[PDB]
Nucleic acid binder design. Structure first.
Ligand code: MG
Ligand code: MG
Ligand code: NA
Ligand code: NA
Length: 326
DNA sequence: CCGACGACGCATCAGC
DNA sequence: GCTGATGCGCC
DNA sequence: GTCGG
């Protein structure tokens, strides 16, 4: 947090390029520089000092010099004043509304929270629920509450089938004091990379978690991935808990280690790792690590019997989940 | 200089 | 209905 | 926007 001002500035520029400019690589470049600056153990004195870090080039260096001198950035100050940009940036905060939908709504005059509420019939299902729990979804989940939700999910899943294994990943597994949402990896013996010996494996759990009124809403749902909303039960006279985003991901049992590496994150860590995998001649997804054959095509899945093995292939020393918060 | 930037599931749509 | 492209989101 | 070829 030594450079909190800088990283906030860069994160804001990242969100600008992603939402308004619709330039996904600029957004990624900014988020990368923010990440590598975030863990830099010195209070940065100059842009030139920052340019040494991987991901900080000439442009960001110049902005950091402007920021450190004045405490602001004129590029952001203007963007803060632009009506179209302020609108798009807000609309994109509703889950389900991306850069395209945001710009399309503004063209119709739908640009405020009030406009969205009088026009629910123009939102798809995801966007309606996103609008519904707009306030709740911007609150953080204390680890105390993550531990409660974990006990519920892990015990309800045990009740459907004793052989289900649920593992809460995300920043929770990274040991964070708070989480923005809950992330659940799910494995069952029947679902392997060889055969689905048993249908509705994800459905059964979703239905069970709905019956005990944990899962309250569904954003999207398929055979392997669930996206929805959940809420902790409150006692008598208690004000209710905020509604929380939950993601449940069914991964084949034998591909657990690539799956648990992947949803443990962070998102930037994964990208840095997967980019590095390519430089070392491998491609990594949620399922497998595969070699890159002489001409580009991915080879066959290499054997993986721990998270560390994936680190070994690409010549990385192992990094505990708590050290992946990039 | 300039090509490449991680990799994928689900909802949604256009084309046939 | 199927196939693929696009939008949005997950880490 | 940045970097490695
Ligand atoms: Mg999360
Ligand atoms: Mg999530
Ligand atoms: Na640099
Ligand atoms: Na959004």
């Amino acid at each position: 947090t030594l450079n909190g001002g800088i990283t906030d500035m860069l994160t804001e520029l990242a969100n600008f390029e992603k939402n308004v400019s619709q330039a996904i690589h600029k957004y990624n470049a900014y988020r990368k520089a923010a990440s590598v600056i975030a863990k830099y153990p010195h209070k940065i004195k100059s842009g030139a000092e920052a340019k040494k870090l991987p991901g900080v080039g000439t442009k960001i260096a110049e902005k950091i010099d402007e920021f450190l001198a004045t405490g602001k950035l004129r590029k952001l100050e203007k963007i803060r004043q632009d009506d179209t940009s302020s609108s798009i940036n807000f609309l994109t905060r509703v889950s389900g509304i991306g850069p395209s939908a945001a710009r399309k709504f503004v063209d119709e005059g739908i640009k405020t929270l009030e406009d969205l509420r009088k026009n629910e019939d123009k939102l798809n299902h995801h966007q309606r629920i996103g609008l519904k729990y707009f306030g709740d979804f911007e609150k953080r989940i204390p680890r105390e509450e993550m531990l409660q939700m974990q006990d519920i999910v892990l015990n309800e899943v045990k009740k459907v089938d004793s052989e289900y294994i649920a593992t809460v990943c995300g920043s929770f597994r990274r040991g964070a004091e708070s989480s923005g949402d809950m992330d659940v990896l799910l494995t069952h013996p029947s679902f392997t990379s060889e055969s689905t010996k048993q249908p509705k494996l994800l459905h059964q759990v979703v239905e069970q978690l709905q019956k005990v009124h944990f899962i309250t809403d569904t954003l999207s749902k398929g055979e392997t991935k669930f996206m929805g909303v959940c809420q902790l039960p409150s006692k008598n006279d208690e004000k209710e808990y905020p509604h929380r985003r939950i993601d449940i991901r069914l991964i084949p049992k034998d591909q657990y280690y690539c799956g648990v590496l992947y949803f443990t994150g962070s998102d930037i860590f994964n990208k840095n790792m997967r980019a590095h995998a390519l430089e070392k001649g491998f491609t990594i997804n949620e399922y497998t690590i595969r070699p890159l054959g002489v001409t580009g095509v991915a080879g066959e899945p290499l054997p993986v019997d721990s998270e560390k093995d994936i680190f070994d292939y690409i010549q990385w020393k192992y990094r505990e989940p708590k050290d992946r918060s990039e």
